[PDB]
């Protein structure tokens, strides 16, 4: 038809600047409009309408090109969906030109009203256009201008379109939010995309961001309950895309997080772990310290705390390291908590002179950590100052003492019943 003759229509305007190209685009705008309108989905050739882009590219500034897209946006544009295929053409000459147009590229994005104002969202284009503007702001040294642009883009979420690529767009703001200096902004984003992708399988490139952003937010929070949770989820489940050589030392930081955290339910799960005992000795060295929680005498701990610090002051695959004082700031506070839990479950009462020697602290530092655990509802101990002792025995009512006595009576009947049936069971050997 007439779409195959477009090459032979205008001979002279190819070799010249062709100032009349703006008039030739308007003549074809009204003719091809009546032949399509909203009826046919795809009728007119998208190259005919996008030919004006290829006419002036490197021979003219991009300011006049944006004015042509403004008139096509306000008008029909020969189709209602034609704008979808026009912006796809815009994404070609951007990366193939560059040169001195990088500074003027910022004005091109802000001039287009489709990327700014909200539309029917047929695009799956402007999402990458917005990212290109933010990458320019990050190279200029603006942390606030980069995070504010993508913040409004994530408000409108497309229906389906990209699946694995959309996850990267949601996780992009979480990386730039911490660089802004506020880690609480990325917390809201972690409560949405994580729930939808929880039941969906993640690929290799998908779990790379969750390995960092999940533990990076809680890094500044200094709360180790959320650090050892999201990390072990990706670590234990799947995680076969990475190398097994670097996969084993990742667990060395996992066990180190349980000590700084207020115990947990994941301590016994790593004791029976197959890969935790064998392979790296640092895995077994930290695992051997887990069984020492109940047997902790505090005697040999500061000797190792001042000598061997493989996972303590040196971090690689998790925290990357901060300072020797920062890692040891909460370390000494936990070691005191490990000893007080043992004494509360063992010693009924102990003198202050001996308690200070077991805690290696003074009189003021001893009652500081003990009284803090009382308000948290963990250890209840009555400190007797005149007797210079601390009573760890909690008071019990008359009903509680008689209740435990009733469990023993029912337990004695179990041993009487068990032995009663063992006479017939062992009669085979006795009656042989």
């Amino acid at each position: 038809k007439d779409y195959s003759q477009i090459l032979k229509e205008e001979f002279p305007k190819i070799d010249s600047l062709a100032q009349n190209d703006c008039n030739s685009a308007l003549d074809q705008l009204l003719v091809l409009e009546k032949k399509t309108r909203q009826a046919s989905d795809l009728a007119s050739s998208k190259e005919v309408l996008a030919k004006i882009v290829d006419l002036l590219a490197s021979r003219n500034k991009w300011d006049d090109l944006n004015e042509q897209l403004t008139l096509l946006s306000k008008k029909h544009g020969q189709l209602k969906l034609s704008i979808q295929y026009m912006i796809q053409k815009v994404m070609e000459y951007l990366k193939s030109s560059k040169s001195l147009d990088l500074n003027t590229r910022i004005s091109v994005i802000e001039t287009i009203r489709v990327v700014t104002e909200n539309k029917i969202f047929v695009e799956v284009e402007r999402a990458r256009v917005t990212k290109d503007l933010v990458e320019i702001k990050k190279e200029e040294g603006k942390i606030d201008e980069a995070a504010d642009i993508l913040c409004e883009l994530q408000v409108e979420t497309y229906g389906s379109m990209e699946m694995s690529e959309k996850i990267q767009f949601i996780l992009e703001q979480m990386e730039l939010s911490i660089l802004k200096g506020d880690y609480s902004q990325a917390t809201v984003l972690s409560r949405k995309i994580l729930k939808k992708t929880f039941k969906n399988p993640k690929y290799e490139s998908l779990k790379l961001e969750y390995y960092n952003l999940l533990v990076k937010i809680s890094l500044h929070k200094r709360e180790y309950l959320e650090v050892a949770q999201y990390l072990q989820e990706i670590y234990q489940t799947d995680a076969i895309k990475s190398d097994e050589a670097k996969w084993k030392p990742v667990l060395s930081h996992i066990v180190y997080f349980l000590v700084l955290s207020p115990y947990g339910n994941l301590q016994n799960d790593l004791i029976h772990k197959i890969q935790n005992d064998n392979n790296l000795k640092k895995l077994e060295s930290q695992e051997s310290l887990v069984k020492l929680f109940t047997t902790n005498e505090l005697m040999r701990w500061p000797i190792v705390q001042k000598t061997y610090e493989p996972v303590l002051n040196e971090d690689d695959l998790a925290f990357g390291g901060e300072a020797n004082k920062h890692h040891w700031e909460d370390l000494q506070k936990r070691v005191i908590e490990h000893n007080l839990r043992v004494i509360s479950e063992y010693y009924s009462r102990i003198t202050l002179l001996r308690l200070n020697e077991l805690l290696d602290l003074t009189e003021s530092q001893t009652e500081t950590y003990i009284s803090d655990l009382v308000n948290q509802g963990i250890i209840y101990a009555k400190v007797n100052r005149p007797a210079k002792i601390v009573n760890f025995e909690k008071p019990k009512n008359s009903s509680q003492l008689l209740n435990e006595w009733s469990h023993n009576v029912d337990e004695l009947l179990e041993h009487i019943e068990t032995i009663g049936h063992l006479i017939t069971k062992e009669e085979i050997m006795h009656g042989l």
Partner: protein, 163 residues
């Protein structure tokens, strides 16, 4: 009208009713912006946080100051002064309470209306301070308590038998 309503509730306490007028008033002054003075909106923000402190709620106080959309263009040292008081009231100690007491006295205490509340919090937090000293149950020394709080023996013993 709603601003002066909750102010009359300061004498009879019951700050749960006055909080209803303080919350609804903040939306009125925030919508005026340049149509009124910004100082009037700052006083309304103080009446909401000081009313929740009397009700002994830590979470409701932090839900405002930590939220960036609640303050926005309104920030000062007098607004952040209540943040240090809320932390001192949560920890129940006179060390952090009296630290920001005399420092912000020319700002936070500049209002004669709210000044009567801090005078009641002096004996209120002091009785709450004793709760942190009695954490190791009984069998504590009276002289050891006075050295921690840093007051006179007769002044401490008078407040011990009060509770």
């Amino acid at each position: 009208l709603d601003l002066m309503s909750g102010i009359l509730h300061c004498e009879d306490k019951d700050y749960k009713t006055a909080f209803s007028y303080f919350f609804e008033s903040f939306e009125s002054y925030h919508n005026l912006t340049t149509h009124n003075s910004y100082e009037k909106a700052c006083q309304v923000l103080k009446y909401m946080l000081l009313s929740k402190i009397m009700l002994n709620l830590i979470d409701d106080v932090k839900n405002i100051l930590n939220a960036k959309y609640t303050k926005e263009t309104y920030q000062s040292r007098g607004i952040d002064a209540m943040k240090a008081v809320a932390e001192a009231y949560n920890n129940r100690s006179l060390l952090d309470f009296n630290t920001a007491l005399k420092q912000y006295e020319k700002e936070l205490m500049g209002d004669e209306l709210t000044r009567s509340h801090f005078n009641a919090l002096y004996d209120t937090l002091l009785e709450s301070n004793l709760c942190k000293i009695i954490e190791p149950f009984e069998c504590v020394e009276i002289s050891h308590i006075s050295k921690i709080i840093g007051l006179d023996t007769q002044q401490v013993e008078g407040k011990l038998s009060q509770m």
